[PDB]
Coordinates of C-alpha atoms in Angstrom, one line a residue:
Chain M
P294 CA 150.5 154.0 112.9
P295 CA 147.5 151.9 111.8
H296 CA 145.1 150.4 114.3
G297 CA 146.0 147.0 115.9
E298 CA 142.4 145.8 115.6
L299 CA 142.6 146.1 111.8
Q300 CA 144.6 142.9 111.9
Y301 CA 141.8 141.0 113.7
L302 CA 139.2 142.3 111.2
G303 CA 141.5 141.4 108.3
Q304 CA 141.8 137.9 109.6
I305 CA 138.0 137.6 109.5
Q306 CA 137.9 138.9 105.9
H307 CA 140.3 136.2 105.0
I308 CA 138.3 133.4 106.6
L309 CA 135.1 134.7 105.0
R310 CA 136.9 134.9 101.6
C311 CA 139.3 131.9 101.5
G312 CA 138.2 129.9 104.4
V313 CA 136.9 126.3 103.8
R314 CA 134.2 124.3 105.6
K315 CA 135.2 122.1 108.5
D316 CA 133.3 120.5 111.4
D317 CA 134.2 120.4 115.1
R318 CA 133.4 117.5 117.4
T319 CA 129.6 117.9 117.4
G320 CA 129.0 118.1 113.6
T321 CA 129.1 121.9 113.5
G322 CA 129.9 123.6 111.3
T323 CA 132.6 126.2 110.6
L324 CA 134.6 128.1 108.0
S325 CA 138.2 127.3 108.8
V326 CA 141.8 128.4 108.0
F327 CA 145.0 126.8 109.2
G328 CA 147.8 129.1 110.4
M329 CA 147.5 132.8 111.2
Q330 CA 149.5 135.4 113.1
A331 CA 148.8 139.0 114.3
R332 CA 150.9 141.4 116.3
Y333 CA 149.3 143.6 119.0
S334 CA 151.4 146.4 120.5
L335 CA 150.9 146.8 124.3
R336 CA 152.9 150.1 124.3
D337 CA 150.7 152.7 126.1
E338 CA 147.6 150.9 124.9
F339 CA 145.6 147.7 125.5
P340 CA 144.3 145.5 122.7
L341 CA 140.7 145.3 124.0
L342 CA 138.7 145.1 120.8
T343 CA 136.3 147.9 120.0
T344 CA 134.1 146.7 117.1
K345 CA 132.3 144.7 119.8
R346 CA 132.3 144.6 123.6
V347 CA 134.7 142.2 125.3
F348 CA 133.9 140.7 128.7
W349 CA 136.8 142.3 130.5
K350 CA 135.5 141.2 134.0
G351 CA 135.6 137.7 132.6
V352 CA 139.0 138.2 131.2
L353 CA 140.5 139.6 134.4
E354 CA 138.8 137.3 136.9
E355 CA 139.7 134.2 134.9
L356 CA 143.4 135.0 134.8
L357 CA 143.6 135.5 138.5
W358 CA 141.7 132.2 138.9
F359 CA 144.4 130.6 136.7
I360 CA 147.2 132.3 138.6
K361 CA 145.8 131.1 141.9
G362 CA 146.2 127.6 140.4
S363 CA 142.5 126.9 141.0
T364 CA 140.9 124.0 139.1
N365 CA 137.5 124.2 140.7
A366 CA 134.9 126.1 138.5
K367 CA 132.9 127.0 141.6
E368 CA 135.8 129.2 142.9
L369 CA 135.4 131.2 139.7
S370 CA 131.6 131.2 139.6
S371 CA 131.6 132.9 143.0
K372 CA 133.1 136.0 141.3
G373 CA 130.1 136.1 138.9
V374 CA 132.0 134.5 135.9
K375 CA 130.3 131.5 134.4
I376 CA 132.4 130.7 131.4
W377 CA 133.8 127.5 132.9
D378 CA 130.7 126.3 134.9
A379 CA 129.1 124.0 132.3
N380 CA 132.3 122.0 132.1
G381 CA 132.3 121.2 135.8
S382 CA 128.6 120.4 135.7
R383 CA 127.3 117.4 137.8
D384 CA 126.3 115.7 134.5
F385 CA 128.8 116.7 131.9
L386 CA 131.5 115.3 134.2
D387 CA 129.8 111.9 134.1
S388 CA 129.6 112.3 130.4
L389 CA 133.4 112.0 130.3
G390 CA 133.2 109.1 132.7
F391 CA 134.3 111.2 135.6
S392 CA 131.6 110.0 137.9
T393 CA 133.8 110.0 141.0
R394 CA 134.7 113.7 140.7
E395 CA 132.5 116.1 142.7
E396 CA 130.8 119.0 141.0
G397 CA 133.3 121.5 139.6
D398 CA 136.2 119.1 139.0
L399 CA 137.8 120.1 135.7
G400 CA 140.9 118.1 136.4
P401 CA 144.4 119.3 135.5
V402 CA 143.6 122.4 133.4
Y403 CA 145.5 125.7 133.0
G404 CA 145.9 126.8 136.6
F405 CA 147.2 123.4 137.6
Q406 CA 149.5 123.1 134.5
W407 CA 150.9 126.6 135.1
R408 CA 151.8 126.1 138.8
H409 CA 152.2 122.4 139.1
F410 CA 153.2 120.7 135.8
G411 CA 154.1 117.0 136.1
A412 CA 152.3 116.6 139.4
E413 CA 149.8 113.8 139.8
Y414 CA 146.3 115.2 140.0
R415 CA 144.1 114.1 142.9
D416 CA 141.0 116.2 143.5
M417 CA 140.2 120.0 143.2
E418 CA 140.8 120.6 146.9
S419 CA 144.0 118.7 147.3
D420 CA 147.0 120.9 148.1
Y421 CA 149.7 120.8 145.3
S422 CA 152.0 123.2 147.1
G423 CA 155.6 122.9 145.9
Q424 CA 154.5 119.9 143.8
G425 CA 155.3 119.7 140.1
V426 CA 156.7 122.8 138.3
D427 CA 155.7 126.4 138.9
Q428 CA 156.6 127.5 135.4
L429 CA 154.8 130.7 136.0
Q430 CA 157.4 131.5 138.7
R431 CA 160.1 130.1 136.4
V432 CA 159.1 132.6 133.8
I433 CA 159.2 135.5 136.3
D434 CA 162.5 134.3 137.7
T435 CA 164.3 133.7 134.3
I436 CA 163.2 137.2 133.1
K437 CA 164.9 138.7 136.2
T438 CA 168.1 136.7 135.8
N439 CA 168.6 136.1 132.1
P440 CA 166.4 138.4 130.0
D441 CA 168.2 137.1 126.9
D442 CA 166.9 133.6 127.5
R443 CA 165.2 132.1 124.5
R444 CA 163.5 129.4 126.6
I445 CA 161.0 131.4 128.7
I446 CA 158.1 129.1 128.0
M447 CA 154.9 128.2 129.9
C448 CA 153.3 125.1 128.4
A449 CA 149.8 124.0 129.4
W450 CA 149.7 121.0 127.1
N451 CA 150.3 117.8 129.0
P452 CA 149.7 114.6 126.9
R453 CA 149.5 112.6 130.1
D454 CA 146.7 114.8 131.5
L455 CA 144.6 115.2 128.3
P456 CA 142.3 112.3 129.1
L457 CA 141.7 113.8 132.6
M458 CA 140.6 117.3 131.6
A459 CA 137.2 118.7 130.7
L460 CA 138.8 119.6 127.4
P461 CA 142.4 120.1 126.2
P462 CA 143.7 123.7 126.3
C463 CA 143.0 125.9 123.3
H464 CA 146.3 127.6 124.3
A465 CA 149.0 125.1 124.1
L466 CA 151.9 127.3 125.2
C467 CA 153.1 130.9 125.5
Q468 CA 156.6 132.2 125.2
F469 CA 158.1 135.4 126.6
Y470 CA 160.8 137.6 125.2
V471 CA 162.8 140.5 126.6
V472 CA 164.8 143.2 124.8
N473 CA 165.6 146.8 125.6
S474 CA 163.7 146.4 128.9
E475 CA 160.6 145.5 126.9
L476 CA 158.6 142.3 127.7
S477 CA 156.8 140.7 124.8
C478 CA 154.7 137.6 124.5
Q479 CA 153.7 135.1 121.9
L480 CA 150.7 132.8 122.3
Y481 CA 150.1 129.6 120.4
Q482 CA 146.4 129.1 120.2
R483 CA 145.6 125.7 118.5
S484 CA 141.9 126.6 118.0
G485 CA 140.2 130.0 117.8
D486 CA 136.6 131.2 117.6
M487 CA 137.1 134.5 115.7
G488 CA 133.6 135.5 116.6
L489 CA 133.4 134.8 120.3
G490 CA 136.7 133.3 121.5
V491 CA 139.6 135.1 120.0
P492 CA 139.0 138.7 121.2
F493 CA 138.8 137.3 124.7
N494 CA 142.1 135.4 124.3
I495 CA 143.9 138.6 123.2
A496 CA 142.9 140.5 126.3
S497 CA 143.8 137.5 128.6
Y498 CA 147.4 137.3 127.4
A499 CA 147.9 141.0 127.0
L500 CA 146.9 141.2 130.7
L501 CA 149.3 138.4 131.8
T502 CA 152.1 140.3 130.0
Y503 CA 151.1 143.5 131.7
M504 CA 151.2 141.7 135.0
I505 CA 154.6 140.1 134.5
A506 CA 156.1 143.3 133.0
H507 CA 154.9 145.2 136.0
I508 CA 156.4 142.7 138.5
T509 CA 159.7 142.3 136.6
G510 CA 160.0 146.1 136.2
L511 CA 159.7 146.1 132.4
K512 CA 157.5 147.8 129.9
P513 CA 155.1 145.8 127.7
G514 CA 156.0 145.3 124.1
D515 CA 154.1 143.3 121.5
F516 CA 151.7 140.5 122.0
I517 CA 151.9 138.0 119.1
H518 CA 148.8 136.0 118.5
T519 CA 149.4 132.8 116.6
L520 CA 146.5 130.6 115.5
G521 CA 146.2 127.1 114.3
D522 CA 142.7 126.2 113.4
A523 CA 141.3 129.7 112.9
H524 CA 137.6 129.2 112.2
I525 CA 134.3 131.1 112.0
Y526 CA 131.1 129.4 112.9
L527 CA 128.5 129.6 110.1
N528 CA 125.9 131.1 112.4
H529 CA 128.2 134.1 112.9
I530 CA 129.0 134.8 109.2
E531 CA 126.3 137.6 109.0
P532 CA 126.9 139.3 112.4
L533 CA 130.6 139.3 111.6
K534 CA 129.9 140.8 108.1
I535 CA 128.2 143.8 109.7
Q536 CA 130.9 144.2 112.4
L537 CA 133.6 144.4 109.7
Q538 CA 131.8 147.6 108.6
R539 CA 132.4 149.2 112.0
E540 CA 135.4 151.5 112.5
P541 CA 137.8 150.6 115.3
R542 CA 137.8 153.1 118.2
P543 CA 141.0 154.0 119.9
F544 CA 142.2 151.3 122.2
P545 CA 141.7 151.8 126.0
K546 CA 144.5 151.8 128.5
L547 CA 145.2 149.2 131.2
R548 CA 146.6 150.8 134.4
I549 CA 147.7 149.1 137.6
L550 CA 146.6 150.9 140.7
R551 CA 149.3 149.8 143.2
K552 CA 152.9 148.5 143.2
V553 CA 152.7 144.7 143.3
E554 CA 155.9 142.7 143.8
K555 CA 154.7 139.1 144.0
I556 CA 152.4 137.6 141.4
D557 CA 149.9 135.8 143.5
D558 CA 149.1 139.0 145.3
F559 CA 147.5 140.6 142.3
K560 CA 143.8 141.3 142.9
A561 CA 140.9 142.3 140.6
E562 CA 140.8 145.8 142.1
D563 CA 144.4 146.5 141.1
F564 CA 143.5 146.9 137.4
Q565 CA 141.5 149.7 135.8
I566 CA 140.5 150.1 132.2
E567 CA 140.1 153.7 131.1
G568 CA 138.8 155.1 127.8
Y569 CA 137.0 152.0 126.6
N570 CA 134.1 152.8 124.3
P571 CA 133.3 149.9 122.0
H572 CA 130.4 149.5 119.5
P573 CA 127.0 148.3 120.7
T574 CA 126.0 144.7 120.0
Chain D
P1143 CA 152.3 132.5 91.3
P1144 CA 154.7 133.9 93.9
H1145 CA 157.8 131.8 94.9
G1146 CA 157.6 130.4 98.4
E1147 CA 161.3 131.1 99.2
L1148 CA 160.6 134.8 99.0
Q1149 CA 159.1 134.6 102.5
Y1150 CA 162.3 133.2 103.9
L1151 CA 164.5 135.9 102.2
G1152 CA 161.8 138.4 103.2
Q1153 CA 162.1 137.5 106.8
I1154 CA 165.9 137.9 106.6
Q1155 CA 165.5 141.4 105.1
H1156 CA 163.3 142.4 108.0
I1157 CA 165.6 141.1 110.7
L1158 CA 168.6 142.9 109.1
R1159 CA 166.5 146.0 109.0
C1160 CA 164.2 146.1 112.0
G1161 CA 166.2 143.7 114.2
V1162 CA 167.8 144.6 117.4
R1163 CA 171.0 143.5 119.1
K1164 CA 170.3 140.5 121.4
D1165 CA 172.9 138.1 122.8
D1166 CA 172.5 134.4 123.7
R1167 CA 173.9 131.8 126.1
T1168 CA 177.5 132.5 125.2
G1169 CA 177.6 136.3 124.9
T1170 CA 177.0 136.3 121.2
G1171 CA 175.8 138.2 119.4
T1172 CA 172.7 138.4 117.2
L1173 CA 170.0 140.5 115.5
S1174 CA 166.6 139.5 117.0
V1175 CA 163.0 139.7 116.0
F1176 CA 160.2 138.1 118.1
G1177 CA 157.3 136.7 116.2
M1178 CA 157.4 135.6 112.5
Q1179 CA 155.3 133.3 110.3
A1180 CA 155.7 131.9 106.8
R1181 CA 153.6 129.5 104.9
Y1182 CA 155.2 126.9 102.6
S1183 CA 153.0 124.9 100.1
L1184 CA 153.6 121.2 99.8
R1185 CA 151.4 120.8 96.8
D1186 CA 153.4 119.1 94.0
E1187 CA 156.6 120.6 95.4
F1188 CA 158.9 120.5 98.4
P1189 CA 160.2 123.6 100.1
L1190 CA 163.9 122.8 100.0
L1191 CA 165.5 126.2 99.9
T1192 CA 167.5 126.9 96.8
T1193 CA 169.4 130.1 97.5
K1194 CA 171.9 127.9 99.3
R1195 CA 172.5 124.1 99.3
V1196 CA 170.6 122.3 102.1
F1197 CA 172.0 119.1 103.6
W1198 CA 169.1 116.9 102.6
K1199 CA 170.8 113.7 103.7
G1200 CA 171.0 115.1 107.2
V1201 CA 167.4 116.3 107.0
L1202 CA 166.3 112.8 106.0
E1203 CA 168.5 110.8 108.4
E1204 CA 167.7 113.0 111.4
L1205 CA 164.0 112.5 111.1
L1206 CA 164.2 108.7 110.7
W1207 CA 166.5 109.0 113.8
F1208 CA 163.6 110.8 115.6
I1209 CA 161.0 108.2 114.7
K1210 CA 163.5 105.6 115.9
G1211 CA 163.0 107.0 119.4
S1212 CA 166.7 107.6 119.5
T1213 CA 168.6 109.9 121.9
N1214 CA 172.1 108.5 121.1
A1215 CA 173.8 111.0 118.8
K1216 CA 176.2 108.4 117.6
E1217 CA 173.4 106.3 116.1
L1218 CA 172.9 109.2 113.7
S1219 CA 176.6 110.0 113.2
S1220 CA 177.0 106.4 112.0
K1221 CA 174.8 107.3 109.1
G1222 CA 177.1 110.1 107.8
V1223 CA 175.4 113.0 109.7
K1224 CA 177.6 114.8 112.2
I1225 CA 175.3 117.4 113.6
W1226 CA 174.5 116.2 117.1
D1227 CA 177.9 114.8 117.9
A1228 CA 179.3 118.0 119.5
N1229 CA 176.1 118.1 121.6
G1230 CA 176.6 114.5 122.7
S1231 CA 180.3 115.2 123.1
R1232 CA 182.3 113.8 126.0
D1233 CA 183.3 117.4 126.8
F1234 CA 180.0 119.2 126.1
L1235 CA 178.4 116.8 128.5
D1236 CA 180.9 117.6 131.3
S1237 CA 180.1 121.3 130.6
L1238 CA 176.6 120.4 131.9
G1239 CA 177.1 118.2 135.0
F1240 CA 176.6 115.1 132.8
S1241 CA 179.9 113.7 133.7
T1242 CA 178.2 110.5 134.9
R1243 CA 176.5 110.3 131.5
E1244 CA 178.0 108.4 128.5
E1245 CA 179.0 110.1 125.2
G1246 CA 176.2 110.5 122.6
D1247 CA 173.6 110.5 125.3
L1248 CA 171.7 113.8 124.6
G1249 CA 169.1 113.0 127.2
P1250 CA 165.3 113.1 126.7
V1251 CA 165.5 114.9 123.4
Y1252 CA 163.0 114.7 120.4
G1253 CA 163.1 111.0 119.7
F1254 CA 162.2 110.2 123.3
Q1255 CA 159.4 112.8 123.7
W1256 CA 157.7 111.8 120.4
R1257 CA 157.6 108.1 121.3
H1258 CA 157.6 108.1 125.1
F1259 CA 156.2 111.4 126.5
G1260 CA 155.9 111.4 130.3
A1261 CA 158.3 108.5 130.8
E1262 CA 161.0 108.5 133.4
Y1263 CA 164.2 108.8 131.4
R1264 CA 167.2 106.8 132.4
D1265 CA 169.8 106.6 129.6
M1266 CA 170.3 106.1 125.9
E1267 CA 170.2 102.3 126.2
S1268 CA 167.3 101.2 128.3
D1269 CA 164.1 100.4 126.3
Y1270 CA 161.0 102.5 127.2
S1271 CA 158.6 100.2 125.4
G1272 CA 155.0 100.7 126.7
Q1273 CA 156.2 103.8 128.5
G1274 CA 155.2 107.3 127.8
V1275 CA 152.6 108.6 125.4
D1276 CA 153.4 107.7 121.8
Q1277 CA 152.6 111.1 120.4
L1278 CA 153.8 110.3 116.9
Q1279 CA 151.5 107.3 116.5
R1280 CA 148.6 109.0 118.3
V1281 CA 148.8 111.7 115.7
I1282 CA 148.7 109.3 112.8
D1283 CA 145.9 107.3 114.5
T1284 CA 143.8 110.4 115.0
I1285 CA 144.4 111.6 111.4
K1286 CA 143.2 108.2 110.1
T1287 CA 140.0 108.1 112.2
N1288 CA 139.2 111.7 113.0
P1289 CA 140.6 114.3 110.6
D1290 CA 138.4 117.1 112.0
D1291 CA 140.3 117.0 115.3
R1292 CA 141.6 120.4 116.4
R1293 CA 143.9 118.7 118.9
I1294 CA 146.4 116.8 116.8
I1295 CA 149.5 118.0 118.6
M1296 CA 153.0 116.5 119.0
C1297 CA 154.5 118.5 121.9
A1298 CA 158.2 118.0 122.5
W1299 CA 158.4 120.5 125.4
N1300 CA 158.4 118.8 128.8
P1301 CA 159.2 121.2 131.7
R1302 CA 159.8 118.2 133.9
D1303 CA 162.5 116.6 131.6
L1304 CA 164.0 120.1 131.0
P1305 CA 166.9 119.6 133.5
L1306 CA 167.8 116.0 132.2
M1307 CA 168.1 117.0 128.5
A1308 CA 171.1 118.6 126.8
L1309 CA 169.5 121.1 124.5
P1310 CA 165.8 121.9 125.2
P1311 CA 163.9 121.7 121.8
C1312 CA 164.0 124.6 119.5
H1313 CA 160.9 122.9 118.1
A1314 CA 158.5 123.1 121.0
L1315 CA 155.5 121.6 119.2
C1316 CA 153.9 120.8 115.9
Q1317 CA 150.2 120.7 115.1
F1318 CA 148.5 118.8 112.2
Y1319 CA 145.4 119.8 110.3
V1320 CA 143.3 117.9 107.8
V1321 CA 140.7 119.4 105.5
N1322 CA 139.4 118.2 102.1
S1323 CA 141.9 115.2 102.2
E1324 CA 144.8 117.7 102.7
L1325 CA 147.2 117.3 105.6
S1326 CA 148.7 120.5 106.8
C1327 CA 151.3 121.1 109.6
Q1328 CA 152.4 124.0 111.7
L1329 CA 155.6 124.1 113.7
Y1330 CA 156.1 126.5 116.6
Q1331 CA 159.9 127.1 116.7
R1332 CA 161.1 128.5 120.0
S1333 CA 164.2 130.1 118.4
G1334 CA 165.6 130.2 114.8
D1335 CA 169.1 130.5 113.5
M1336 CA 167.9 132.1 110.2
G1337 CA 170.9 131.9 107.9
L1338 CA 172.0 128.5 109.3
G1339 CA 169.5 126.2 111.0
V1340 CA 166.2 127.5 109.7
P1341 CA 166.3 126.2 106.1
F1342 CA 167.2 122.8 107.5
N1343 CA 164.4 123.1 110.1
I1344 CA 161.8 123.9 107.4
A1345 CA 162.7 120.9 105.2
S1346 CA 162.5 118.6 108.3
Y1347 CA 158.8 119.2 109.2
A1348 CA 157.8 119.3 105.5
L1349 CA 159.2 115.8 105.1
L1350 CA 157.4 114.7 108.3
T1351 CA 154.2 116.0 106.7
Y1352 CA 155.1 114.1 103.5
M1353 CA 155.6 111.0 105.6
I1354 CA 152.5 111.1 107.7
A1355 CA 150.3 112.1 104.7
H1356 CA 151.7 109.1 102.8
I1357 CA 150.9 106.9 105.7
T1358 CA 147.4 108.3 106.1
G1359 CA 146.6 108.3 102.4
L1360 CA 146.5 112.1 102.1
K1361 CA 147.9 114.8 99.9
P1362 CA 150.1 117.3 101.8
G1363 CA 148.8 120.9 101.8
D1364 CA 150.7 123.6 103.7
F1365 CA 153.6 123.8 106.2
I1366 CA 153.2 126.9 108.3
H1367 CA 156.5 128.0 110.0
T1368 CA 155.8 130.0 113.1
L1369 CA 158.9 131.6 114.7
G1370 CA 159.5 133.0 118.1
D1371 CA 163.0 134.4 118.6
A1372 CA 164.1 134.6 115.0
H1373 CA 167.7 135.8 114.9
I1374 CA 170.8 136.3 112.7
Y1375 CA 174.3 136.0 114.0
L1376 CA 176.4 139.1 113.3
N1377 CA 179.0 137.1 111.4
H1378 CA 176.3 135.9 108.9
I1379 CA 175.0 139.4 107.9
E1380 CA 177.2 139.8 104.8
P1381 CA 177.0 136.2 103.6
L1382 CA 173.2 136.5 103.9
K1383 CA 173.1 139.9 102.1
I1384 CA 174.8 138.4 99.1
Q1385 CA 172.3 135.5 99.3
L1386 CA 169.7 138.2 99.2
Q1387 CA 170.8 139.1 95.7
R1388 CA 169.9 135.7 94.4
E1389 CA 166.6 134.7 92.6
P1390 CA 165.1 131.4 93.9
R1391 CA 165.1 128.5 91.5
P1392 CA 161.8 126.5 91.3
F1393 CA 161.4 124.1 94.3
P1394 CA 162.3 120.4 93.8
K1395 CA 159.9 117.5 94.4
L1396 CA 159.8 114.6 96.8
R1397 CA 158.9 111.3 95.2
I1398 CA 158.2 108.4 97.4
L1399 CA 159.6 105.4 95.6
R1400 CA 157.4 102.8 97.2
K1401 CA 154.4 102.2 99.5
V1402 CA 154.9 102.2 103.3
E1403 CA 152.1 101.0 105.7
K1404 CA 153.6 102.1 109.0
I1405 CA 155.7 105.2 109.8
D1406 CA 158.4 102.9 111.3
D1407 CA 159.0 101.0 108.1
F1408 CA 160.4 104.2 106.5
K1409 CA 164.0 104.0 105.1
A1410 CA 166.3 106.5 103.4
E1411 CA 166.1 104.7 100.1
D1412 CA 162.4 105.4 99.7
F1413 CA 162.9 109.1 98.9
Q1414 CA 164.2 110.9 95.8
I1415 CA 164.8 114.6 95.6
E1416 CA 164.1 115.7 92.0
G1417 CA 164.7 119.1 90.3
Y1418 CA 167.0 120.5 93.1
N1419 CA 169.1 123.3 91.6
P1420 CA 170.4 125.4 94.5
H1421 CA 173.0 128.2 94.4
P1422 CA 176.5 127.3 95.6
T1423 CA 178.6 128.9 98.4

C-alpha cells in the first residue's frame, strides 16, 4: 500500500504545475484548480498529515463545538481555540452590517445548520431545541435502520441563511455510506487552502466519521475529499515547494478511550492520538 | 489527446472489478463504489457519450423544464419525454402517502428548488413568484458581476422539503467556476445508475453550462462529474461489458443557432447536435 498523504502532496504538485491565477474576495492572489478528489483510508490509521504539523486540538475542539450546535465563537475560544474569533469580532460584525448582534454572533453557521436546519435564527443564546432539522441525528439514525440508504446527507449550505452568516461554509455537504459494516464519508469542499486549510479539513471529517462509526457500531472505511476551487496562495508557493520534498511519516492512530453511545456526550478527553511524529515547520 | 469517454468506461470497469454487493430501496441489487470523479471538457465539443445512444431530446427538454420552475411531470410528458411520469404516477404517489396529491405532482423537485429555494411548497399549480431564493438567476448574476466568486452554488438538497418531495435529488448540488473567461461546472451526484442514468446526467449539466456560459458571454471549460454511490445493477453487467469492447467515436458539438439574452428565453429549437455517431443497442 502507498501512503495516503501522497495524494495531498500530488494535488499540490498539480496546482503548482497546471494551476492558473485567480483572486479571492480581497484581491489576493492564488494559483487555482477546479475539481479534485482524494481518498483517505481510515482503516486502522488516521489521515493526520505528517509533512507538516496539524492543529489537532483545534480540529477536535471545533468539531465538538459544531456538534454542540454552538454558534457563539466565545464558547469555542474558552477552550483555547481562536480560529473563529476574528469573525465574531465587535467590529467585523458591523462590517457585514450586523450592528445589532453582540460580540461572537456568527449567525447560522455549521453547528446551527447541522442540528437545526430550516429554523429561524434569533441570537447565539436562543434555544433552538427540537427546532428545525437535526440532520446529524438523522444521519446516525438512518445508518442504524437502513445502512443501504443512499441519502445519508448532512448539508450545511442554506441559501436563505447565507446573508446572515459571517461567511458561507467551505464545506457545502457531506454524505455517508455503509457497506460490509464499514462507514465511509465523502465531503464536498467548495473552497480549499491546500497550504493551511485542507489538512485541517481532512482531520475534521475523518474525526466525525470515527465518531459516528463508533456510535453506530461500525468500523471506519474511506474518507473521500472532493474539492471545488482548490487553490494555493502565492505567498505559500515556496514553503510548499520545500514541503513536497519531505517524506510522509506513518500516519498516527485515533483511539476512543470510552464506550460512548449518544453523540452529544463525546468529550475532548475521549480521543487520543498516538504515534504522531510530523515534520518541523 | 485522450478521449473523454474513457473515464466513463474506466469507472464502469472499476465498479465491475472492485465493486461490492449493495442493495437499494427495493431489495435490488447492485455493485457499489463510493466516491468517483471524472472531468469532461466542453471546449469545442460536447460530452454526449457515444458507446450507446443518449436520449438528447429528453436531456434538452428536461432542463428547460427545470428552468421553467416546473414540478408537474405531465408538462414534460407533453413534450415527448416520458421519464418522470411513473414518478408522478397516480399509483406511485399513493405508494408514498400522496393520495391527497394530484397526478404529475412530483413535489418540491428540481424546478422548484432552483427558482424558489426556501419557499413553502403547496402544489404543482400555485405560483411561487417572489418566493424562495432564485438560485439559477443568482448564479448567472454572480457570474456576470463577480466571476472570482468561490460561492457560486445551486443547491437542490433541502432537508426541510425532503418529506414533501417524491424522489429526493440524485443531483444534490452544482458549483460554477470562472477563470480566464472560461465557465466550469461541478456536479455532486448523490447516487449514479452507471449503465443507465449517468450518461444522461452528464449531458444534462454540460448543457446547463453551455446555456449559462452563452448567457454570460463565456466559453465553457470543464464539467467535473463527482459521484457518491456509483453503482451498477446486476442485470446490466453483461450489456455493459459488451459496451466495454467498443471504442468511443469523437464527441459531437453543440451549436447555439441564435442569441439568447436571458436563460428563460431558451427554446428547444435553438440547439443543434452535430457529429453524433453513437453505437447502437
